[PDB]
Design a protein around this ligand. Structure first.
Ligand SMILES: CCCCCCCCCCCCCCCCCC(=O)OC[C@H](CO[C@@H]1O[C@H](CO[C@H]2O[C@H](CO)[C@H](O)[C@H](O)[C@H]2O)[C@H](O)[C@H](O)[C@H]1O)OC(=O)CCCCCCCCCCCCCCCCC
Ligand code: CLA
Ligand code: CLA
Ligand code: CLA
Ligand code: CLA
Ligand code: CLA
Ligand code: CLA
Ligand code: CLA
Ligand SMILES: CCCCCCCCCCCCCCCCCC(=O)OC[C@H](CO[C@@H]1O[C@H](CO)[C@H](O)[C@H](O)[C@H]1O)OC(=O)CCCCCCCCCCCCCCCCC
Ligand SMILES: CC1=C(/C=C/C(C)=C/C=CC(/C)=C/C=C/C=C(C)\C=C\C=C(C)\C=C\C2=C(C)CCCC2(C)C)C(C)(C)CCC1
Ligand code: SF4
Ligand code: SF4
Ligand code: SF4
Lengths: 154, 143, 159, 80, 31, 743, 93
């Protein structure tokens, strides 16, 4: 496949690592009582590990000679779920945060003592402002086009 | 124009028990400083070098190894005890040099008998760059 | 009664008078050492100092040296002591050359503890220091030779 | 000896003179401000380079500038 | 006759000694 | 003259007005923030009461209330301990089989795969092993069930609430007046007798009734749940009579002065209990009884209200000789008007006391099953050592603060202090010489050994087999201690500790509890290293304190204050001339000294003390006695100690100790991060922040509160804080992982 | 200087600045003439700055060269040389 890697579902070292992990987890389980709280916790962890490995095989991740999943970020459409749509999600959230904070700073910049509203957050105004980050992708775009995103005269 | 007071030996020195912060060989071969004041009453003050000393009644004379020490002592005498002081620089040859207050009035108060030294008639931002004074003995600020 | 006093009663000189600094026996002992025999020819004081130091240096080199266990311990240690004396002579000569000039008087103090005049110690001159260092070198070599001869060359049970 | 310069922006506030710990600066008659005063540096040979004067100057940029230069036993503040 | 035996002390003891003495004399005295 | 209770009503009314205003104490701070620097200042001077005001009464009231708050915090911490032991611990399982189960009183919820930290500690329990040694304390106290731990936790919570209320009430409702705080005679009398003596008597009373009978039943092999409850032993007295017959007479021996009859449970045996590996509880009870008597007597010294007693002023002023003029005259007035003087004295004493506590606690273990719990021993020793070192450094910090701020010869003149300030130059010069001499001969010998070993000349090394440097004095002293019982101290059967000698190795559960510690050439070298480091740090701190007010460089250093960056680049440069900077350097040197001390302790214990006993009595030590021959070179310390023993921590990944490896790496990171602050200056950072702020201004997103770079002193403080945190934490992780995996 | 409490006078600056010799003897030679007459006569040729310096440097250099170039086997193991066969490297040698 890409970069000489093979799918984890049909890879062999991936399955070997899965088996070894479960064996290691089970080794501890046999020491305690069959149905004690530690035994239940260890069983839950084993089930979690099995579910994790099955999901990794299901999503179609690529596994190297090491038997571990590898992430392709070149832009291949078969792997957009590895970096590109999480990347878009991060960009949206981070722009939300930055736009909300900038809106707060611009809103409080007109008082005689703006610093007072900076060490003591004016929550009433902040609660109204935080929701602009839902549509910041549009507000920032029209802010740039309208030419007042960037401070002229500087 | 303010004849500076002449240093008067025989004036008593402050009561002091001795210290390891006194004069050294520099006083012997280079220079040392002497400060004099009046102090209306006998009282205990903090020495600029060691512990505490007591000013005698009437004139007091103290010899220090640094001018900065003399100035610190004078500042304490002027602000804490409200005493007028003057100090000199003494060379191994036997010379004495009146130092402060140079013209009878302390340097803080403007006096009509002082000329300007090292005053530039321009803002600090109008000095030439080093390239213009390169390979000449002058510095850009000396101009 | 207080024991510690300012120097000569002058409380503005950076020092004190203490039993260690100025006690009768200590003052006498210090004044009777070659370094402080001001009115004596510097060569003889140097001879005494060199003898003492050269004899001193032999012990540590011989006993603690790399060849202490070997039969040639005495020879090796004595040679090392002689070499150290030679290096000390070099140091003395360069110090004197750098710190003194022929045409200048002695830099030693001219006053004593009572304020009376006295001839400044000639050791602090150029030729005075040259004589002192030559005497020190001679005395050091002689002391090393004597310490080496006293042991090994002669049995003389010690330790 | 360090070089101390007074520039014409000085407002004669006197704060630098109060600060000098070796009596290097002074106040002299002048006519270009309300105080008719300006700082002078006639005794820079006693300057130690502490730059305590510059910390007191309220003008922007400074009106008193200390340029550290050749070092002497007086400038190095040595008592021995 | 072993050439290294002669030179190693010469360059490690004699040379630094003479050089340091000469340079101390040069640096440390008024001209 | 008389001692009485003086207070003032409603000095400050509880309210929320000052909460809304950040930094009410300082007027400029109260005005508001101009730059980010403001914020830092607000924290840097939070507890600097003597700077916010000048009235001694207000400072004293604030100090008293803050003491109440901190006491409340400590009580809350203890309540948390007892609750966690009660609910989230395997205390009963450990109680049934001490040597078998590894103590643990913390579990982690399973959220992000961190449940791996819930390791197998034994007793049908999975959690994080604890090295605080609480299980041993609870066993020694007689706690057998979790109901008692629950009750103790609830009581400690209630006392934390009471402490908090007391602080509020004393600062806001009834604030003692200054004369009340200045009454030191009655204070000393009560603390010596009311607190220490009476508290020790109370604890001895508990031990006689609860610790002794309960621990006797436990050591007899009775299951913990079958033991009579601690209160039964008080109701029916034959319960006690069975274990110790002398309880039959009951108190009459105490009142007829037939005290010998109490020899059953009040002994002078010494040594260790061969079953539990700790001190005999019958010795500890007698200990606390004697201590109670001594303190109750000593707390009757100073005069308060009935003429009889001692005036501290009289005692002080009665001492003076020809070498010190009128010494001790005026010290009473100094120590009753300045809090920093008292704080420095007390900090020095408490640091020394904590260090001594560490030494004595690993010397003769006082709790059952503590000696063979190697992790607990190592952790306790290291913890107490670090606490003591920090307190000692704080002593110097506050001595310098007093010297700068409260020292005044015009009104409060003392002769001894004046003489010290007058010959400080000689003091510091001789201390400097001693430091150099010790450094050359202690460390130089290590370098000599290393060079000889590298050149293939082991016969020239300073070792036990080449050139021996035997500590004859220490050997003689510990030999005199070994012969002590029966010769010079007839009433004792066993020596004070098993480290002195006499053989009689003590082991528990197949593990060595204690045995004689030999002193050789390596011990000599490391002890001289210790002396060197202590002397250098003392030099730094003492020079900071003595030259705090003035020196030949800056004759008016006091006018600048205790804390300040410098005095400019004049006089060649006056960087770090303040006393605060001397404390800042003393911190580094204290870290060096304590690190070397704990390394010595750990390696020596592993090499020559800790280990496993076998059937024939052959002791196999954790490290096969390589300290004597490998510790005499730096290469051995790097190889046989650091490299060899780091394997446990670095491998911890994939197991319950993985957290220790994570903290190892993180501590390395934080330590290296500190160098960022320790090596740079604030000018570069301010210049860079200028460009950053411009980039922000370009987008109308610049903060109103201007972001300034950290102050110089703050840069130093941050650097030292991060350095200490990183180093101490990496050593913490290393020690814990090594001793839990190998112990 | 020293009248009562005065500690300063321009007439005698040496005393004022503490230019004393704490331990100078100012006493005659403790040696009898005969011993000095020998020492000053046999140690005379070593009291010249340049001569002594040059002689010391070159004599010490020649002594070191001679003693190091003619050392015996029991002195320095470096020049006694190896006495064992040489081992091989992991693959080189
Ligand atoms: C499923 C298919 C259909 C989808 C339809 C979806 C519709 C959007 C989602 C939900 C709509 C219902 C929301 C609850 C109703 C009340 C909201 C409101 O009117 O609440 C009133 C506010 C007022 O809005 C504007 O608010 C701005 C800021 O004012 C104030 O903002 C703050 C308000 O607390 C402070 O008062 C502050 O001092 C002041 O600046 C403007 O200047 C004006 O005041 C005003 O026009 O709306 C606010 O944004 C309040 C904050 C929540 C807004 C949520 C928007 C969606 C994201
Ligand atoms: C860089 C050149 C250099 C050289 C060539 C040497 C050579 C030597 N060193 Mg040295 N050393 C050096 C650098 C050097 N060292 C440095 C930089 C250090 C500081 C780390 C030391 C620290 C050191 C120590 C601590 C010791 C040595 C010792 C020795 C001697 C050991 C072998 C022996 O037993 O011979 C023969 C042994 C003898 C005792 C004969 C002494 C050597 C001759 C005969 C002395 C004659 C000197 C002569 C008058 C010239 C004076 C110097 C002049 C050139 C200016 C050997 C001659 C060991 C020693 O021998 O003690 C002295 C020893 O203890 N070295
Ligand atoms: C920069 C080049 C260089 C370097 C790094 C060395 C380094 C070394 N030489 Mg060597 N040497 C060199 C050039 C160099 N040599 C040349 C060009 C010759 C003449 C062909 C020699 C002849 C020589 C002999 C006979 C011996 C050594 C030996 C040694 C070793 C012991 C120290 C010593 O004896 O000092 C060097 C001794 C000399 C006689 C050097 C004189 C030759 C040059 C021109 C001196 C340069 C001085 C100059 C002012 C400084 C150069 C600039 C800068 C590097 C400071 C040492 C590793 C000894 C040895 O074998 O080790 C066991 C030894 O006995 N050398
Ligand atoms: C319970 C209600 C209450 C209220 C409303 C107040 C109100 C007030 N107190 Mg007060 N006080 C209280 C309880 C209260 N106090 C108690 C219980 C104590 C005993 C400790 C004190 C002792 C006290 C003193 C000594 C002083 C005040 C002062 C003040 C006034 C100044 C602002 C202030 O409070 O500091 C700020 C508010 C805070 C919440 C700061 C935090 C302090 C806590 C203790 C920190 C907790 C420590 C924490 C565990 C540390 C670990 C960190 C970790 C979590 C990361 C203010 C009007 C000061 C004053 O009146 O000035 C003249 C004053 O000096 N109080
Ligand atoms: C301070 C640490 C230290 C100490 C104690 C020693 C000690 C020793 N080294 Mg050594 N060494 C050291 C560091 C040290 N080394 C370091 C850092 C290096 C570089 C890596 C070396 C490298 C080295 C080499 C290569 C060799 C030694 C050797 C030796 C031995 C003989 C050295 C000798 O004779 O010199 C001369 C000794 C003296 C001149 C004595 C002077 C000191 C006197 C006794 C004290 C004076 C104080 C006095 C009591 C004050 C009282 C005053 C009163 C009278 C008024 C000796 C036991 C040699 C050896 O063979 O080892 C066995 C050897 O060859 N060393
Ligand atoms: C029996 C008398 C007695 C006792 C037992 C104590 C005990 C204590 N005092 Mg105290 N003191 C006393 C008399 C006493 N004092 C007198 C007469 C004066 C006036 C001269 C003072 C003035 C004084 C000051 C100024 C300070 C103390 C402090 C402390 C505490 C020190 C820290 C500690 O070790 O915590 C040990 C913890 C415990 C022992 C836990 C139990 C605590 C109990 C409940 C204490 C109850 C004792 C108290 C005096 C009861 C009277 C109040 C009553 C109306 C309820 C400690 C609890 C310091 C402090 O504030 O504490 C942080 C402190 O700053 N005391
Ligand atoms: C009972 C002990 C004690 C007491 C009551 C005091 C009391 C005081 N000290 Mg002091 N000190 C002590 C011990 C003590 N100290 C010790 C042991 C040392 C040596 C380390 C010092 C060194 C010291 C210095 C250098 C200074 C003081 C200062 C002060 C005064 C102001 C402190 C302040 O509020 O600043 C603000 C306090 C803080 C900002 C808290 C600092 C937070 C630390 C660095 C973080 C700790 C990290 C934590 C342990 C682990 C990481 C957790 C994190 C990751 C969440 C105050 C009266 C200052 C002063 O000016 O005196 C008048 C001052 O300059 N002390
Ligand atoms: C030189 C060091 C030294 C030390 C540290 C001790 C320490 C001790 N001795 Mg001891 N003793 C010593 C020398 C020493 N002794 C010598 C040289 C002799 C004669 C050979 C004795 C004979 C001796 C006897 C007969 C007894 C002790 C006892 C004791 C213990 C109780 C002390 C006591 O009675 O309270 C202090 C008592 C006082 C009267 C206060 C006065 C303090 C002195 C005299 C000052 C104590 C651990 C007693 C014991 O058996 O311990 C359980 C006991 O019976 N000693
Ligand atoms: C998809 C990711 C890419 C998105 C690109 C968005 C469009 C960028 C081009 C338009 C930028 C713009 O109009 O503003 C251009 C901005 C300033 O914006 C200008 O401001 C002017 C003064 O107010 C006028 O209002 C103009 O209408 C306005 O465009 O300046 C620049 O970025 C320099 C580019 C050349 C102009
Ligand atoms: C695709 C991809 C990639 C790459 C890419 C690239 C390379 C590109 C680019 C890019 C670029 C070249 C960019 C740029 C930019 C620029 C500028 C100039 C900008 C800006 C912006 C701004 C300025 C903003 C602001 C704001 C906001 C909006 C947010 C919040 C608020 C604030 C105000 C902050 C890779 C292959 C890796 C992978 C896959 C994916
Ligand atoms: S640098 Fe210091 S000493 Fe020099 S002129 Fe300025 S204030 Fe005075
Ligand atoms: S501080 Fe500045 S403005 Fe004020 S007098 Fe001095 S030079 Fe002029
Ligand atoms: S580098 Fe910093 S601490 Fe040093 S003199 Fe300059 S400003 Fe002061």
């Amino acid at each position: 496949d890409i970069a000489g890697l093979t799918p984890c579902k049909d890879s062999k070292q991936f399955a070997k690592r899965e088996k070894q992990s479960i064996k290691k987890l089970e080794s501890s389980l046999k020491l305690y009582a069959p149905d004690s709280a530690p035994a239940l916790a260890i069983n839950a962890t084993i089930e979690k590990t099995k579910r994790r490995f099955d999901n990794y095989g299901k999503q179609g991740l690529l596994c190297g000679a090491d038997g571990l999943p590898h992430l392709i970020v070149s832009g291949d459409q078969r792997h957009w779920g590895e970096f590109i749509t999480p990347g878009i999600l991060f960009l949206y959230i981070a722009g939300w945060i930055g736009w909300v904070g900038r809106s707060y700073l611009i809103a409080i910049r007109d008082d005689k003592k703006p610093t007072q509203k900076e060490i003591i957050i004016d929550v009433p105004l902040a609660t109204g402002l935080v929701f602009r980050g839902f549509s910041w992708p549009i507000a920032a775009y029209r802010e740039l086009l309208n030419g007042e995103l960037v401070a002229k005269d500087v | 124009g303010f004849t500076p007071p002449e240093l008067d030996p025989n004036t008593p020195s402050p009561i002091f028990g001795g210290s390891t912060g006194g004069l050294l060989r520099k006083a012997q071969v280079e220079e040392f400083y002497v400060i004099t004041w009046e102090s209306p009453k006998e009282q205990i003050f903090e020495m600029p070098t060691g512990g505490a000393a007591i000013m005698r009644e009437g004139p007091n004379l103290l010899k220090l190894a640094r001018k900065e020490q003399c100035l610190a002592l004078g500042t304490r005498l002027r602000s804490k005890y409200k005493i007028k002081y003057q100090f000199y620089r003494v060379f191994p040859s036997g010379e004495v040099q009146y130092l402060h207050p140079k013209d009878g009035v302390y340097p803080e108060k403007v006096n009509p008998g002082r000329q300007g030294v090292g005053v530039n008639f321009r803002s600090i931002g109008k000095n030439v760059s080093p390239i213009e004074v390169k390979f000449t003995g002058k510095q850009p600020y000396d101009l | 009664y207080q024991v510690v006093q300012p120097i000569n009663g002058d409380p503005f000189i950076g020092s004190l008078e203490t039993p260690v600094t100025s006690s009768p026996l200590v003052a006498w002992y210090l004044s009777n050492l070659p370094g402080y025999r001001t009115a004596v020819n510097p060569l003889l004081r140097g001879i005494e100092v060199g003898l003492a130091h050269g004899f001193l240096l032999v012990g540590p080199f011989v006993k603690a040296g790399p060849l202490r266990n070997t039969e040639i311990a005495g020879q090796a240690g004595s040679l090392a002591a002689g070499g150290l004396v030679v290096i000390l002579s070099i140091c003395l000569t360069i110090y004197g050359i750098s710190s003194f000039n022929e045409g200048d008087p002695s830099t030693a103090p001219s006053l004593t503890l009572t304020g009376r005049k006295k001839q400044p110690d000639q050791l602090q001159t150029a030729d005075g220091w040259a004589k002192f260092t030559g005497g020190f070198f001679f005395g050091g070599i002689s002391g090393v030779t004597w310490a080496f001869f006293l042991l090994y060359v002669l049995d003389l049970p010690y330790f | 000896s360090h070089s101390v310069k007074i520039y014409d922006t000085c407002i004669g506030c006197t704060q630098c003179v109060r600060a000098c710990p070796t009596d290097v600066l002074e106040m002299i008659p002048w006519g270009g401000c309300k105080a008719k005063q300006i700082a002078s540096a006639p005794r820079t040979e006693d300057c130690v380079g502490c730059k305590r004067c510059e910390s007191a100057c309220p003008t922007d940029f400074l009106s008193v500038r200390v340029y550290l230069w050749h070092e002497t036993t007086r400038s190095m503040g040595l008592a021995y | 006759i072993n050439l290294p035996s002669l030179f190693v002390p010469l360059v490690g003891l004699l040379f630094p000694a003479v050089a340091m003495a000469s340079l101390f004399l040069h640096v440390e005295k008024r001209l | 003259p008389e001692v009485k209770i003086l207070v003032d009503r409603d000095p400050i009314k509880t309210s929320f007005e000052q909460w809304a205003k950040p930094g009410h104490f300082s007027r400029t701070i109260a005005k508001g923030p101009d730059t980010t620097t403001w914020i830092w200042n607000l924290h840097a001077d939070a507890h600097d009461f003597d700077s916010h005001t000048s009235d001694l009464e207000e400072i004293s009231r604030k100090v008293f209330s803050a003491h109440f708050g901190q006491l409340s915090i400590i009580f809350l911490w203890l309540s948390g301990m007892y609750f966690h032991g009660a609910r989230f611990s395997n205390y009963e399982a450990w109680l049934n089989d001490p040597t078998h189960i590894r103590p643990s009183a913390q579990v982690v919820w399973p959220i992000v795969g961190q449940e791996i930290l819930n390791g197998d500690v034994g007793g049908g329990f999975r959690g994080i092993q604890i090295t605080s040694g609480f299980f041993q304390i609870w066993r020694a106290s007689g706690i057998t069930s979790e109901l008692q731990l629950y009750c103790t936790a609830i009581g400690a919570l209630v006392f934390a609430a009471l402490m908090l209320f007391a602080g509020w009430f004393h600062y806001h409702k009834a604030a003692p007046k200054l004369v009340w705080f200045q009454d030191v005679e009655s204070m000393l009398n009560h603390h010596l007798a009311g607190l220490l003596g009476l508290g020790s008597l109370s604890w001895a009373g508990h031990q006689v009734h609860v610790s002794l009978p309960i621990n006797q039943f436990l050591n007899a092999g009775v299951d913990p749940k079958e033991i009579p409850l601690p209160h039964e032993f008080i109701l029916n007295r034959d319960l006690l009579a069975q274990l110790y017959p002398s309880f039959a007479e009951g108190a009459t021996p105490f009142f007829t002065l037939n005290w010998s009859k109490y020899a059953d449970f009040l002994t002078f045996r010494g040594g260790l209990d061969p079953l539990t590996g700790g001190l005999w509880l019958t010795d500890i009870a007698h200990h606390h009884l004697a201590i109670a008597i001594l303190f109750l007597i000593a707390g009757h010294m100073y005069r308060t209200n009935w003429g009889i007693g001692h005036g501290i002023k009289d005692i002080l002023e009665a001492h003076k000789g020809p070498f010190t003029g009128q010494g001790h005259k005026g010290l009473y007035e100094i120590l009753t008007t300045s809090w920093h003087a008292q704080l420095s004295i007390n900090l020095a004493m408490l640091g020394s006391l904590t260090i001594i506590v560490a030494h004595h606690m690993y010397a003769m273990p006082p709790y059952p099953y503590l000696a063979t719990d190697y992790g607990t021993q190592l952790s306790l020793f290291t913890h107490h050592m670090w606490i003591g070192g920090f307190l000692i450094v704080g002593a110097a910090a506050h001595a310098a603060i007093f010297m700068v701020r409260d020292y005044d010869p015009t009104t409060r003149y003392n002769d001894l202090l004046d003489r010290v300030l007058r010959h400080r130059d000689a003091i510091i010069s001789h201390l400097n010489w001693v430091c150099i001499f010790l450094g050359f001969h202690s460390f130089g010998l290590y370098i000599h050994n290393d060079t000889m070993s590298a050149l293939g000349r082991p016969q020239d090394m300073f070792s036990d087999t080449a050139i021996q440097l035997q500590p004859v004095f220490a050997q003689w002293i510990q030999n005199t201690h070994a012969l002590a019982p029966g010769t010079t101290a007839p009433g004792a059967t066993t020596s004070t500790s098993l480290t002195w000698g006499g053989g009689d190795l003590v082991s528990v559960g197949g593990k060595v509890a204690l045995l004689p510690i030999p002193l050789g050439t390596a011990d000599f070298l490391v002890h001289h290293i210790h002396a060197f480091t202590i002397h250098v740090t003392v030099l730094i701190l003492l020079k900071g304190v003595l030259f705090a007010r003035s020196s030949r460089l800056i004759p008016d250093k006091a006018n600048l204050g205790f804390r300040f960056p410098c005095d400019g680049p004049g006089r060649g440069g006056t960087c770090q001339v303040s006393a605060w900077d001397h404390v800042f350097l003393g911190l580094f040197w204290m870290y060096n000294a304590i690190s070397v001390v704990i390394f010595h302790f750990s390696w020596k214990m592993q090499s020559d003390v800790w280990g496993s006993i076998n059937d024939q009595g052959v002791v196999t030590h954790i490290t096969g006695g390589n300290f004597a021959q490998s510790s005499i070179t730096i290469n051995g310390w790097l190889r046989d100690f650091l490299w060899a023993q780091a394997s446990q921590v670095i491998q911890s990944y994939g197991s319950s100790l993985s957290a220790y490896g994570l903290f190892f790496l993180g501590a390395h990171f934080v330590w290296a991060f500190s160098l960022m602050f320790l090596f740079s200056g604030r000018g570069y950072w301010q210049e860079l922040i200028e460009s950053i702020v411009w980039a922000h201004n370009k987008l109308k997103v610049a903060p109103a509160t201007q972001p300034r770079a950290l102050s110089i002193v703050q840069g130093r403080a941050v650097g030292v804080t991060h350095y200490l945190l990183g180093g101490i934490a990496t050593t913490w992780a290393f020690f814990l992982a090594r001793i839990i995996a190998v112990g | 200087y020293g009248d009562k409490s005065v500690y300063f006078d321009l007439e005698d600056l040496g005393n004022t600045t503490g230019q004393w010799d704490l331990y100078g003897s100012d006493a005659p030679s403790p040696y009898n003439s005969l011993q000095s007459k020998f020492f000053e006569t046999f140690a005379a040729p070593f009291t010249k700055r340049g001569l002594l310096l040059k002689f010391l440097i070159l004599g010490g250099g020649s002594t070191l060269a001679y003693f190091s170039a003619t050392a015996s086997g029991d002195i320095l193991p470096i020049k006694k040389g190896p006495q064992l066969p040489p081992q091989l490297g992991p693959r080189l040698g």
